Design a protein around this ligand. Structure first.
Ligand SMILES: O=C(O)C1=C(c2ccc3ncccc3c2)CCC1
Length: 166
């Protein structure tokens, strides 16, 4: 958890313009959050990038978790190995509002972060899930009570989030 170069937005939310894969490889945090789907199929976005950085070890483990436990619920999570990226990966399912899933479940999704004192994470439901990323940061700030270090890849999005916040 030796994070560096973050800007503190609130007592417990920090942000950096960084690639979450590179941050995980540098810091090897106790927990890295994945922006997952209910079947843990890590096909694109942050999920595809974290799985690729494990050379598909994350996907093989996830398929076994699903065969034994069934799919997650939207707003839910599971804890699996972080492989080379972290001690643990917290796979969290935010709603895909582009498919009619309820935006209220974004609060439920962020509540899962409270089971861990420190996390490295992306914004949930941003990208292909369709939620406005600045709304997702507001829900994170209003819901997460533990220490969360948010990595945002895109510089234009990062500058917009920092300006809206501070
Ligand atoms: O943080 C961003 O800029 C966002 C996304 C993203 C998408 C793909 C990524 N592939 C590798 C590492 C980080 C990634 C991050 C999806 C929406 C917002």
């Amino acid at each position: 958890n030796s994070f560096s170069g973050y800007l503190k937005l609130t007592d417990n939310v920090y942000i950096k313009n960084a690639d979450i894969v590179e941050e995980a490889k540098k810091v090897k945090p106790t927990v890295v959050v994945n922006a997952a789907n209910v079947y843990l199929k890590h096909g694109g976005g942050v999920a595809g990038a974290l799985n690729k950085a494990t050379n598909n070890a994350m996907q093989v483990e996830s398929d076994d978790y699903i065969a034994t436990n069934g799919p997650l619920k939207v707003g839910g999570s599971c804890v699996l190995s972080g492989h080379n990226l972290a001690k643990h990966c917290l796979h969290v399912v935010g709603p895909n509002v582009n498919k009619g899933e309820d935006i209220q479940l974004l609060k439920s999704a962020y509540e899962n972060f409270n089971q861990h004192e420190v996390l490295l994470a992306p914004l949930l439901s941003a990208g292909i899930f369709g939620a406005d990323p600045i709304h997702s940061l507001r829900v994170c700030v209003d819901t997460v009570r533990t220490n969360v270090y948010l990595a945002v890849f895109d510089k234009n999005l990062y500058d917009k989030l920092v300006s809206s916040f501070l």
